[PDB]
Amino acid sequence: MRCIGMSNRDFVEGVSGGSWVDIVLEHGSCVTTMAKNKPTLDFELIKTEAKQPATLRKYCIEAKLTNTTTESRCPTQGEPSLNEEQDKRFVCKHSMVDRGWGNGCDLFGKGGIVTCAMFRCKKNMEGKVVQPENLEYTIVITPHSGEGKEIKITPQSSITEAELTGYGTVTMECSPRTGLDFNEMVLLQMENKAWLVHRQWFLDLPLPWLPGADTQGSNWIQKETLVTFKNPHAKKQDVVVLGSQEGWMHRALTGATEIQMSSGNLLWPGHLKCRLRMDKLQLKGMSYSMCTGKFKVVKEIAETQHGTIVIRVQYEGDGSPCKIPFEIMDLEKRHVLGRLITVNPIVTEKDSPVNIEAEPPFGDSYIIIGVEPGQLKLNWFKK
Amino acid sequence: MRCIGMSNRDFVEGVSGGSWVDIVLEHGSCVTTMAKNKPTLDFELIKTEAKQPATLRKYCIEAKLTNTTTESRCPTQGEPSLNEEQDKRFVCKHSMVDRGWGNGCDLFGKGGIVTCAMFRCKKNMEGKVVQPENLEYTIVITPHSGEGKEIKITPQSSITEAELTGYGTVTMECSPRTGLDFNEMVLLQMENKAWLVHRQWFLDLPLPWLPGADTQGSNWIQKETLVTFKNPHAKKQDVVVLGSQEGWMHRALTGATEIQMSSGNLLWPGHLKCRLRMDKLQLKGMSYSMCTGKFKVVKEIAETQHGTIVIRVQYEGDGSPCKIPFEIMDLEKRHVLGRLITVNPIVTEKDSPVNIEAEPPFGDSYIIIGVEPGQLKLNWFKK
Ligand SMILES: *[C@@H]1O[C@H](CO)[C@@H](O)[C@H](O)[C@H]1NC(C)=O
Ligand SMILES: *[C@@H]1O[C@H](CO)[C@@H](O)[C@H](O)[C@H]1NC(C)=O
């Protein structure tokens, strides 16, 4: 479930001296709002989507060499230039070797030689500069009824409305924060994890890179960082790559800042500070008859991780949509004790199970739910 | 070809005041020995094989995780221990999550959870301590005839003999050197290249390692260096590797000392200082008649990279195995000028081509090869 049973959930209650109550919404946390005559709402931040990030530079971390050619000459015959020297998709190397009889040349001496190989990247990571203003926050408002409404907000339109399903409307004004010095900070993505590193530290990485505005994927820059030519023997210099740089990147990003994922969705850390105005909220119910008084416990008392207690029951009896007779009594039945979180428990159908939550006082307490013809008298010992 | 036309070739001549001449044999270099009445020999170091190296430790650089299991519990139900915790081939992780209704548990609160995954290494490098005394050096001695004898030496048996094919025998005494502080130095092998690194720097590498005496390949030590558990959500913590560490190793070994290969054979740098005693060497020939005097130039004059000049000719004429009339004359035919490198050029067969090498003086010189009935009078301009 949500909110109830979430270790990171804060309660808040609007005073009777006005409205405009402040809440703090963060990812993985729920906020519970309530007041007298006002319905209880649950606010939760779902995802923080940073749409339209600007690709800054693309580095290659795993490449492969194919189409390796080699051409040699004899002493006093000129250098052996290859056509692949005029191709940015290739990397070449010149050298000189000893030439004479046993290798089939004119005379003795230093003969030139050239070896080229096609550079083709296989796996490559990316880096993007992210804009702070065009961020998007998804918030879910749920009426705490026990039987959600989404809203997208952005720093360029912090004011919004919320047409709840039969509960009225509530006004929101949020102000955000999500990091540190975003303009000169780059989100690095390895197509498996994500980090937030410095701009200068990212721009000067010793790897074959391509500019942001690029779709070629073959005219890289500084390919020699992943390509080394071995010592030439008879002819071919035996060019060789340097394997994969995935582990080097995973190890070099230790002192960075990683961002988890929810299968695609980036979990951006940060908190929204929001003002809520609930003066235009109505309670779904009120004008309802009382139920006949038969209730069967689907499952009885169970305290949450925030002092509040919850019971799930079913109406079963017939009496239309009606209000649940619910009272919190002493060890006897003197006065009413704890308050109610799920304000005005209603019933949509006799077969639909309904949960209810409330905060009891210390020690022994009674819960009277249902009229006498089938009254549920559930005792418990809080704390 | 060899020796002739090798840019790293040194000449040496034994004086008439005894024998025991010193030479320096290194990989990729040839030594030319000669003297009056003594045949010319070519010494070359082929391979430096360090047989029987002692494996010290085996590190893994590319692993993969399979057989991932996960088990959870409810609050006040105990921790969920898995059977894979008692298996060194697995890596596990404990955690606690929020549990209540929507995830099917008893009540609310912190419920334990455990996730394990089988650690299986795919590609792994090795490190070996190498012994200096049990080194093996392969030397090739070739009689400079123009138409080789191998010997294996070790520091534990530096004295040897050389039964040349019809030239007598020569005595050798070599003393070696090949590096720096071998006892606390480890040869690192990645099954593609080889380095020589420090012992302490190698023993403390942050990678899953196994002791030297090991054939298991699955009960590694410190596997968590290549395994990280992501944040748990509903149940599985989503364990993930760190890719491949091949690039990290290839980059970290920059300030080391690399060793090239000749397809399997390690090219150990170093020089052997050898004493040669050639007093028991005879010249294959001497008691031979002179040829009739017909020679056709297979290919004429061509100077090497060490001042010496070479011509390849064929006998063609009939006259049994005979000695070649060969003289170096002035611009006229006054006196004999340059000496001869291929001492006493013989002939095995009239159809077998034969090379000849000699050093001429400055400027113009004549080469008289063959008796007058078909005499070859080849002029050239050295320097
Ligand atoms: C590389 O070699 C393959 C196989 O011969 C060939 O199909 C391909 O066209 C070559 N590419 C280049 C750029 O030469
Ligand atoms: C891992 O899973 C495969 C596929 O189910 C199975 O064949 C293998 O026996 C499993 N290994 C272990 C150690 O559980």
Residue numbers in the entry:
A (entry chain A), B (entry chain A): 1 to 147, 159 to 394
Copy out sentences from the published article reporting this entry, exactly as the authors wrote them.
The DENV lipid envelope contains 180 copies of the envelope glycoprotein (E), which covers the surface of the virus particle. On the mature infectious virus particle, E is arranged in a herringbone pattern as antiparallel homodimers that pack laterally into a lipid raft containing three dimers. The E protein monomer contains three predominantly β sheet domains (DI, DII, and DIII) connected to a transmembrane domain by an amphipathic helix. As DENV enters the cell, the E protein undergoes a pH-induced conformational change from a dimeric to a trimeric form that triggers fusion of viral and endosomal membranes required for releasing the viral genome into the cytoplasm of the cell.
Variant SC.10, which builds on SC.14 with a single additional mutation G106D (IntFc8), further raised Tm1 to 53.9°C and lowered the Kd to less than 100 pM at 37°C. The exceptional stability of the SC.10 dimer is likely due to simultaneously stabilizing the central dimer interface (IntFc2), the hinge (UndPk6), and the FL dimer interface (IntFc8), all critical regions that regulate dimer stability. To compare SC.10 and WT sE structures and to validate the accuracy of the Rosetta design models, we determined the crystal structure of SC.10 at 3.42 Å using molecular replacement (MR). Despite growing the crystal at pH 4.4, SC.10 retained the prefusion DENV2 sE dimer conformation. The SC.10 crystal structure follows this pattern and has a DI/DII hinge angle that supports a conformation that is flatter than what is observed on the virion. However, these changes do not appear to have a large influence on the binding of potently neutralizing EDE1 human monoclonal antibodies because the WT DENV2 sE protein crystallized with EDE1 antibodies adopts a conformation that is similar to the structure we observed for SC.10 (16, 36). In addition to the structural rigidity that prolines can provide, the new hydrogen bond may be helping to stabilize the sE dimer. As predicted by the Rosetta model, the two mutations in IntFc2, T262R and A259W, lead to canonical pi-cation interactions across the central dimer interface between R262 on one chain and W259 on the other chain. The two UndPk6 mutations, F279W and T280P, are in the kl loop of the DI/DII hinge. T280P is at the base of the kl loop, and in the SC.10 structure, the backbone at residue 280 is shifted to create a new backbone side chain hydrogen bond between the P280 backbone carbonyl and the T189 side chain hydroxyl in an adjacent loop. Instead, in the SC.10 structure, D106 forms an intradomain hydrogen bond with Q77, and alternative rotamers are observed for K310 and W101.
